[PDB]
Design a protein around this ligand. Sequence first.
Ligand SMILES: *CC(=O)[C@H](Cc1cccc([N+](=O)[O-])c1)NC(=O)OCc1ccccc1
Length: 257
Amino acid sequence: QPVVKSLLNSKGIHYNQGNPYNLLTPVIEKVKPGEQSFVGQHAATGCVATATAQIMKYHNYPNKGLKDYTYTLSSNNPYFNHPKNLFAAISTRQYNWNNILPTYSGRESNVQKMAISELMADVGISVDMDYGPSSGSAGSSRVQRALKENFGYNQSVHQINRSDFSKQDWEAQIDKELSQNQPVYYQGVGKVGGHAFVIDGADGRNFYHVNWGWGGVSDGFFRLDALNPSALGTGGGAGGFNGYQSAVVGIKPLEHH
Ligand SMILES: *CC(=O)[C@H](Cc1cccc([N+](=O)[O-])c1)NC(=O)OCc1ccccc1
């Protein structure tokens, strides 16, 4: 395993799912029975969108969106009145990567905040985000399609599933991406839910650097079979994203880079 210093940290890239990343997600409409109100607040961007947007910022790509996307929220979503259709005019977008900053502390301009919020909202819509206080997407299978079909990334983009490879061949694919300066979209499931995040480095002893999409919290080095951030888990126990694992690899704009 080659040593690769965190690719996203080298470019200052640290996004989250709340403000000011979520200023253009749908505004919650209803109180879920038995829950406190989130009415009038923007929905979370979704960890799938935050992970994908961080990788897109690493490439500063695309300059122009390629294809619009439309979908309808599940009618069992309790936060919105139904039917609720969502639409992103991605084919008209000119993303200004000077305004989509690597991270946000609060002092940025409204133009800069709207720039990342627009990208976050477009990406979430393109993966059929089930918006709410928490926002869920199927992840990899939608991400790989969106990156190519809506955002014009190279045909090298594809999902790989952990169950299809030996441990060595799985890690060798991740290592190959990192050797080509290509952060990897990654997701998994376990006893603290399902989460999507970015693998962007390697320490030479079979640990990988992870950007969890929480603004920096819990980022660090993890084994791919012990993706267990301490920021999650109530009661003191163990838990991580070690089942049903998949990745999106080949993420680059061009045929060679
Ligand atoms: C990480 C995140 O925002 C989201 C959390 C979540 C929100 C709403 C519903 C669920 N749910 O499990 O029904 C979860 N998780 C997420 O989007 O996970 C993506 C994913 C990870 C692993 C496998 C499939 C999908």
